[PDB]
Each structure stands twice: as C-alpha cells, then as structure tokens.
Design a protein around this nucleic acid. Structure first.
Ligand SMILES: [Zn+2]
Lengths: 80, 60, 153, 24, 125, 98, 120
RNA sequence: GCAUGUGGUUUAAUUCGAAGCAACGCGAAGAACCUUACCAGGCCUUGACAUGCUAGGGAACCCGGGUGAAAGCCUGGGGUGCC
RNA sequence: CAACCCCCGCCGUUAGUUGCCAGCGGUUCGGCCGGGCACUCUAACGGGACUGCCCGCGAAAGCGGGAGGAAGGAGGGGACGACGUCUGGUCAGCAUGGCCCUUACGGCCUGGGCGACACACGUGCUACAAUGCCCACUACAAAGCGAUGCCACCCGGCAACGGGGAGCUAAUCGCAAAAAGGUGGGCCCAGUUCGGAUUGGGGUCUGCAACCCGACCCCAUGAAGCCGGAAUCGCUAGUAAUCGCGGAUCAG
C-alpha cells in the first residue's frame, strides 16, 4: 500500500542507459547501484545486476514483475 | 567533531536534505538548539558564565 | 506515619441528604475521580430502594453499614519464627472504612448488569443480613474466634 | 479504542484527521 | 454588589442584585450552565447560610478553569460580595469558612519524574 | 497616534527606558496612555547537567522577552523634539509605526 | 435468515450482521443499506423476504467475497512469493512483512514462544 | 499484542560507551542518503581545514564536453585586475 | 541548615487597544460601535505571620489547643547539595600528558548497516469492557509556538491531501478540537459495535530518493487477550488515579 503520487521514479543513470540497449536489441549485463528505482513496463526483459552491501546481484526481469522496485530483489541481510 | 566533518558539514550539498547542524562552538552534531546554535553541553557552559543574553536560570 | 498519628481528613457532607457517611461511600465507588459519575450511581441506586422498598434509603444505608462492621479481626505476627494470627478488637475508625469498602468490592461482583443496580441490591441484602457484604464480614470473624487460641499477645 | 485508528478516540489519539474525525 | 471569586486558575465575576432569586451565568440560567453536575448546588450554600435565599439575583460571569471548580469559584465570590451587603455577616460565614481560598493548585512536573510525584518504576535493584 | 513598542530582556532596563519616554512626553506633548505590560514571552531550555549520560539530571533555562507599550495621541513637532535623540538604555529595542 | 455467499448472520441488526461476512466491514454494510433503504435498526429475523433479496442480489454482484476473496489474496501472496521479492521472503519466513522489528514484539507473526538456552 | 532499551545469537558490517542500588524509552532534544564513527566497492593525497618555506607556471574567476553510481579522472574554452 | 532569589495563594500603588450595559446611547444584538477603566486580566513594585494575642503544659527553648486573618507556626512548590566516598562515568562534547597511523588508523563518494532473529530482561503503550464502547448536539483550560511560518475561509475529493486565498510580524491573526464532562439515542454481556495486532488492496505527502527502512488516509482482514506464577514499583492531597493540550529536536 506504498506510494509515489504522480510521476514514478527511475534514475536516469540506467534509464537512458538501458533504453540505448533497445536501439541494439538485447545485451547481457547491466550494473548500477541505483536500486532506488521502480521497474518500468519499458524496462522488461533485461538482466540487471544490483548492488548488495558487497556483492552485485544479477536480476532477470519478468513481464509479471513490473510494479516492484530493484531493492526488492537484492537481499542485504544474510541469514541462517 | 572531526574537522573533516565540521568544515565539511558547512559546504553546500547537492541535496538540500543532506544539510545538518553542528555546534558553532564544540562541533557537536547530536543535539544543538537552533535558537542559539550550540551543543546542549555548550549551551549550559556559556549559559553559566553569563555569555548568553537574557538567558537566566528558570524557577517556578 | 512515623512522627504523628496524622489528622483524619474531614469531608463535606452530602448536598442532598447531608450525611458525611454518604460522601464517604460515594468516594468509594468513584474511580478515576469521576466523582460526578459516582454521585449519580448512589442516587439512582437510592431511587431503586424507594421503588423496591417502602423505606427511606437514607435509613437503609446506615443500617446496612451498621451490619457489616466487623468487631473482630486478624493481624499476623512473627513470634517464634512463625506466623501467629492474633485476633484483635478493631477500632471505630477501621470498621467504617472496612464496611464501605466491602460493600463495594462485593457489589461489583454481583451478576447484575447496571452498576447503580448492583449497589441497590447490595444495600438491601445487607440490611437483611445476607449477600456477600455480610459474608465477607462473618468470614473474618470466623477466623477471629477460630484461632482465639492465640489472644494472649 | 485508542489503537483503533478508525474510531473517534482512535484518531484523537494519533491526532490525525480522517473519515472518522473531520474538520466541521 | 460585587465581590470577586477566584479558584484554581479561574475567575468569577459575581453580582448580587436584590431580586426574586435567579442566577444568570455568562448569559444562561444557572441550572442550564451546569447540567448533570452533581455538586452544582454547591454554589448557593453561602446564601442558604444566612437564610437569604431568594432576595437577590445573581448576574454572574466566569472565565478560565473547569466547570467542576468554577462552582467553588462562584461560591467564594458570592461570599465575598455578601460582606458588602452586611459586614456583620462574617459572624455566620467564617465559622463555616466561606471566606477562605486554598492553594490547591496543580503542582509542577519535576524532571526525572512522570508527574509531580509519581517516580518511575525500577525492577531489579 | 505614535505607537511605541518596547521589547527587551531586562525588566528594569525597560522600566526606565519606558519611564524616560513617559517623562519628556508629558512636558512637550499631550495626554499619554501610560506604559503597559503585555504578556511576556518565555523561551525554556531543558538541558542535561552532565555531558555524559544521566537523563535524570537536567538544568532549566529561561529567556524572558518583555513587552512594554506607551501610546501618545496628538503628536506635536515639539513632542518629537524631547523624544528625538534623548535615549540611554542599551539592551532595549524600539520600533515605531504611527 | 440466510445466505450471502453461504453464510447465515442472524437475530441481530442487519448492519451488525453483514460484518460477519468475510468481505464486509463496518463500512460496506452501511453503504449497502444506504443503497437499499432497509432500516438498519431492524433485526435480521424481521426482514421482508423482498427486502432480503435486494440485499442479496446487490452484495453478491458487486463486491468480491468469501468464496472468492480468500482466493485473490492467497494467490496474491504467492505472487511476489514466486518472485525473489524481499516481501515475498518475509512471507516465506513467517516473519513481519510490513517492516517491523525482529528483536522483540513480533510474536504475532511467529505464534507461540520458542525458548532456547543461553549464558549469563 | 505492539514501541522502545539491553543481553545474547547473527552478520561483509549489525560503529562506539553506559552495568547492582547510582546501565537497560540511558549519550542520541529526531539513523531512509546525510547523521555515522561500521562493512563493501570506486576514488584522493601538503591532502576537506591552519601558519609557512624553496623551485617552476598562471589574477582570482566563469562557462562547457568526455568517462561515471557519485567522487574522482581527462579535456576545452572565453579570462586577464591592485602595488 | 536557615535566610536573601523565582513561581503559587490575599491585598495595595503605578499602567490601560485584555477586560465590561460593571452605568448610559445605537446593533447586521458578535462587546459589534461609541464611550467609559470600574471588574477580569496583564506585569513591575510593595504590604502581609512574628507562635505577635488568649488558655494549658513547660525552668527555657518549645509543644497542644483557640481567635482574628486570604494564609499559621517552615502556608504549597522551586532553584539551592558541606568535608569527602566509590580509583564511579566520561579521553565519542570539549580540552589535555603519554604511546600508537600518517599513502594511511587519514579524506571524497556510491550502496549496505546501526532496524538483523530460536530466545531473554528493563522502561512503557493498547486492552481484556457496561462506573463501559459508538454516533450525534452541546460547555468550561492552561501554557506554549508561528516568514515563507501558523493558515482563517471557499471549492474538489469518502479521506489523508490538493487548488484558491484573507489575517498575523502576533495580549488584537492562527495552530484550536481541549478531553474527560453534560443531553439524546444505539449496544445487552458476547470474544462481542470489547480489542486493534497482522496481512491483502488502493491512495496522500515529505523529500534526489521511502525496497532494505518513513508517517498518514480509505476498504477488507480482525490475532493475543476474559484481568495476569513466584516475585516486584509508585504515591501521604490537589498527591495518586484519570483526561486532553503545548514544545524542544525536526523535510518528514
Ligand atoms: Zn558545541
């Protein structure tokens, strides 16, 4: 039930970095710290590597997973 | 207070949220009063010597 | 109290009847200082006595109190490396206080819904020498001369 | 009723306003 | 006849005019400004003291405090004005102690505490 | 209709300062409403005595900003003379709006 | 007095009653009587068979309820669950999801207390 | 039941102190970055701050671009006072 | 130690843009306007209790009781902590002897963490309900804070909020509704209209950014819990219990 009003956020760092990967079709690996960002319907299908606290976790994006953020896929807390 | 952070917390930041306080005197950051701009310790310190005008010791 | 017996707070008699005994009782119902509420309780509990009994509630009240005042009590004591229940003649002050209190503690334990009601019934069954108000009275005494084997301390 | 953030007191407590406590 | 009744941070403007016997407070009937208030009757006690009920009117105003205090506040005021009418009245008033005023004021919350007295609870000392 | 507000920190400093305006205002002016108190606004400071950690310590500091008013109706060019540059208090701030 | 979904709320007031239904809370109920003119004050047992039906037809063809609500949620959970979503994991672990603390008061999501050994 | 402090266990890090009464909603009267002292990874060295010295080049200053997560690195311009 | 100093209670003087038919004239009958400082108030100074008076006890100090008085014997509450004790705490506030690093034990940044959870204790909050819960109409408070800040009022929206926009530099505008209470009516003793945990879902706002980790709103969900083992805390009067309001810090 969280919310960012009118104007969904995504860091231009990868936005205009990932879109350029559209002019060529597909790529393989993306690495950027901004996990601040929401995921866009315009972003589906790429394999983005997000930063943990030390590692860089690779995340495949699904047609079914557009409404969540990047951080929601990079677990920080190692447990058990 | 580390000089590396007094003088630091003074230069304008790229984001307005980032800007916090410090005590002009001690350099403390934990609890300065805006009104005087001094570390709670510091407030007392001068409050006592009589260096903060109109600043008396409350009694009621 | 170490230095003195300390004076006993004097109360303002009732605005209605005028007996301080009244004011004392009400104080006892009152919780959280909502003395305006507890005031009502007593009055509406009085009105119940009028409708349910051909008698002035003022009188009924006193006689009910009069009947639960235990005149005998226990007060534990360590003599011999042991707890010896010493029965003892209770003073005037402590009776009146024990009465009112028990009247109440007992009342709120009634199966009845409305508070004022609970008081009303407890106030009657009291003057008729029953209920629990008087039971919490007869029970203490049922310890008084129960262990009267020790009234030599 | 103080935790019931959807009642009278519920709001009065949190000091928030809502469908349960309005502005007159 | 004005007297001035103050009690626990609440002022009471008292006016005794020879009338039928009615109290108007802040513009409303005495018994209307105090509905459901048990100790309400308390205000008039200083009057029924000298058997002077119904001979005066009571134009009363009040500011500050709480209704369950203002009562006493008026109570005093009436008393204080009652001397203006007949100073010789003290004889029947002070024995009943209506010309006294108590510092029943709400004590200051000291620090380290939860109120003016109520200290905080430690468990394993 | 010269409205004179007097805000300060010391109540004696203002009393005098205020009186000083009362005196040379009746000698050359006319009918003055006298000096009036407000209110007075306090600035409390609840600080811990020790610098280390003892919540239960706490010293209490206040800061009283006294407010005094002196009204002068029927403002003459003669009144403004005595009350032109004939002041002496230091920790007193005045402002006029007429 | 019967069936909304498969349920039977009865002998009490309507407004109260309807609460009993999985999908209805102290809100919908009032907004389902305001949309029908049935006076809440009246008990369930004293409803006009016709009055009854209206309520029925309405409530059933608008809000998602028991036989379907419990469903939507259920899978809704498995949603982010099937995904490497943090929130999903908290769900796996049976811990707090919304963001609480996992050091003290959490018990509501762990259930009974599981006491273990320690030192001094 | 939940908030909050602490033990303990955990963790790349879970920064630090406080310890019976006289530690534990205690420094912290305000941890999302910041704060922040911790851990990771990228980067910087007369260094983010003081006073100064010896050699070489330039008023200070201002506005771009490239690379970049930012910092940083590279680069380019206009620019030329007081003695 | 007491006293001198502040706040509280009585009263007096000085002061009237707070206050009022207190007494008169008009009203859109709002103290709104005049007009008036009386009262409330506001605040600066000063008076006032000293066992001074009466009875008793007493060698005296003093004690008990009474009276007049607003107040009594230190009238209530503050600030105010001796010589020293604990090698008390604190070099992470600051300062400072000493040793230790100075291409790093320094400095910038990005992201993570301080929020981790099988458990355990401390301080607390919410509740187990009819002396009660809910909705409605209605009445009394203090003390604070306010410039890009407090926001009247109107409009959109269930609503958080948003759009518009007046007043205040603040005893004269605003935060503001105090709450309990009172009048009506609903509940009828249920795990319930008690209780609000947790979870789904949809939104608002702050802010570069609310995943980790923000409050708020709305719909749904509606858990433990029916008064607490041994044990253990606070409080001697306007106190405890209860009820709401304000501020500091601070974008939130
Ligand atoms: Zn400082």
């Amino acid at each position: 039930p969280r919310s960012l009003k009118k104007g969904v956020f995504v860091d231009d760092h990868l936005l205009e970095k990932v879109l350029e990967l559209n002019a060529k079709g597909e790529k393989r690996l993306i690495k950027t710290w901004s996990r601040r960002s929401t995921i866009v319907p315009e972003m589906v299908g790429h394999t983005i590597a997000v930063y943990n606290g030390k590692q860089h976790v690779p995340v495949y994006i699904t047609e079914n997973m557009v409404g969540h953020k990047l951080g929601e896929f990079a677990p920080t807390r190692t447990y058990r | 207070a580390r000089k590396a952070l007094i003088e630091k917390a003074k230069r304008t930041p790229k984001f307005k949220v980032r800007a916090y306080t410090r005590c002009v005197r001690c350099g403390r950051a934990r609890s300065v009063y805006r009104f005087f701009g001094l570390c709670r310790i510091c407030l007392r310190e001068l409050a006592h010597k009589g260096q903060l005008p109109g600043v008396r010791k409350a009694s009621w | 109290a170490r230095r003195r017996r300390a004076e006993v707070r004097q109360l303002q008699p009732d605005l209605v009847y005028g007996d301080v005994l009244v004011t004392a009782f009400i104080n006892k119902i009152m919780r959280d200082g909502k003395k305006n509420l507890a005031a009502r309780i007593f009055y509406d509990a009085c009105k119940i006595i009028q409708e349910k009994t051909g008698q002035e509630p003022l009188k009924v009240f006193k006689q009910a109190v009069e009947n639960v005042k235990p005149r005998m009590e226990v007060r534990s004591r360590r003599v011999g490396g042991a707890n010896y229940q010493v029965p003892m003649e209770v003073s005037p002050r402590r009776q009146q206080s024990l009465a009112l209190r028990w009247l109440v503690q007992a009342a709120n334990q009634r199966p009845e819904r409305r508070a004022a009601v609970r008081i009303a019934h407890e106030l009657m069954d009291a003057a008729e020498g029953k209920g629990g108000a008087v039971k919490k009275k007869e029970d203490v005494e049922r310890m008084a001369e129960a262990n009267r084997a020790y009234a030599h301390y | 009723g103080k935790g019931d953030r959807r009642t009278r007191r519920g709001k009065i407590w949190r000091g928030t306003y809502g469908k349960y406590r309005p502005r007159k | 006849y004005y007297g001035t009744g103050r009690r626990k941070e609440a002022v009471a403007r008292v006016f005794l005019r020879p009338g039928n016997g009615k109290v108007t407070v802040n513009g409303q009937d005495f018994n209307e400004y105090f509905q459901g208030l048990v100790r309400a009757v308390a205000a008039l006690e200083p009057l029924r003291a000298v058997d002077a009920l119904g001979r005066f009117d009571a134009y009363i105003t009040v500011r500050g405090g709480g209704k369950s205090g203002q009562i006493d506040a008026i109570k005093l005021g009436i008393a204080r004005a009652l001397v203006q009418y007949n100073p010789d009245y003290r004889a029947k008033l002070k024995p009943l102690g209506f010309l006294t005023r108590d510092a029943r004021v709400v004590e200051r919350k000291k620090y380290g505490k939860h109120k003016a007295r109520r200290a905080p609870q430690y468990s394993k000392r | 209709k010269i409205r004179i507000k007097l805000r300060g920190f010391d109540h004696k400093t203002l009393d005098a300062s205020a009186q000083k305006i009362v005196e040379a205002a009746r000698r050359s002016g006319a009918q003055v409403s006298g000096p009036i108190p407000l209110p007075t606004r306090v600035r409390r400071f609840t600080v811990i005595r020790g610098p280390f950690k003892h919540k239960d310590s706490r010293e209490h500091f206040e800061l009283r900003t006294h407010n005094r008013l002196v009204d002068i109706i029927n403002p003459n060019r003669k009144t403004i003379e005595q009350l032109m540059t004939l002041d002496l208090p230091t920790g007193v701030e005045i402002e006029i709006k007429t | 007095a019967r069936i909304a979904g498969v349920e039977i709320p009865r002998n009490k007031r309507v407004d109260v009653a309807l609460t009993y239904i999985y999908g209805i809370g102290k809100a919908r109920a009032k907004e389902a009587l305001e949309k029908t003119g049935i006076n809440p004050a009246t008990r369930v047992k004293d409803l006009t068979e016709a009055e009854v039906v209206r309520l029925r037809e309405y409530v059933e063809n608008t809000w998602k309820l028991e036989g379907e609500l419990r469903a939507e949620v259920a899978a809704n959970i498995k949603r982010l669950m099937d995904i490497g979503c943090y929130r999903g994991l908290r769900h796996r672990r049976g811990l707090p999801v919304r963001g609480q603390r996992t050091r003290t008061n959490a018990r509501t999501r762990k259930g009974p207390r599981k006491t273990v050994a320690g030192k001094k």
